[PDB]
């Protein structure tokens, strides 16, 4: 139960750009989404919904 | 899926099954015209000329 949470809760996910891959006519903003990224502290670690 | 009335929802009804490419990131045209090509590079040591 602990292991399998330190997994989910502390991992590194994916999420495309905004344009990049084939977009729509006349788009203007392409940026990069930044979703879930690893914990970096005993603090952030202390808090894990078990 | 197989909805309650027992119809059929298949990809056609949700995904535009096409046939494009791995990336839409490289676009090239020769003499202002739509083209592909390959950047053939010289292996170390081998003769450019050969």
**Contact indicator for A18, A30 with CB cutoff of 8 Å:** yes
How distant is the Cα of B30 from the closest Cα of chain A, in angstroms? 21
Nearest partner of A20 among A29, A5, A7, A30, judged by Cα? A30
Resolution value (Å, 1 decimal):
2.8
Q: Which residues contact A15 (CB under 8 A, 6 or more apart)?
A: A33, A34, A35
Please state whether beta strands B29-30 and B33-34 pair in parallel, antiparallel, or not at all (unpaired). Answer: antiparallel
C-alpha span between B8 and B6 (Å, rounded):
7
C-alpha span between B25 and A37 (Å, rounded):
26
Which residue numbers of B have CB closer than 8 Å to A's CBs? 20, 23-25
Q: Provide the 3-class DSSP secondary structure of residue A4.
A: helix
How distant is the Cα of B24 from the closest Cα of chain A, in angstroms? 5
C-alpha span between A34 and A20 (Å, rounded):
15
CB neighbourhood size of A8 (10 A): 10
């Amino acid at each position: 139960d602990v292991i399998t949470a330190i997994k989910a809760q502390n991992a590194q996910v994916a999420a495309g750009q905004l344009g990049g891959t084939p977009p729509v006519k006349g788009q203007q903003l392409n940026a990069s989404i930044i979703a879930q990224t690893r914990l970096t502290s005993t603090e952030e670690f202390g808090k894990i919904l078990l | 899926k197989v909805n309650q009335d027992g119809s059929r929802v298949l990809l056609r009804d949700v995904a535009k099954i096409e046939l494009g490419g791995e990336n839409y990131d490289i676009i090239a045209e020769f003499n202002g015209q739509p083209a592909s090509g390959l950047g053939i590079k010289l292996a170390t040591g081998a003769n450019a000329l050969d």
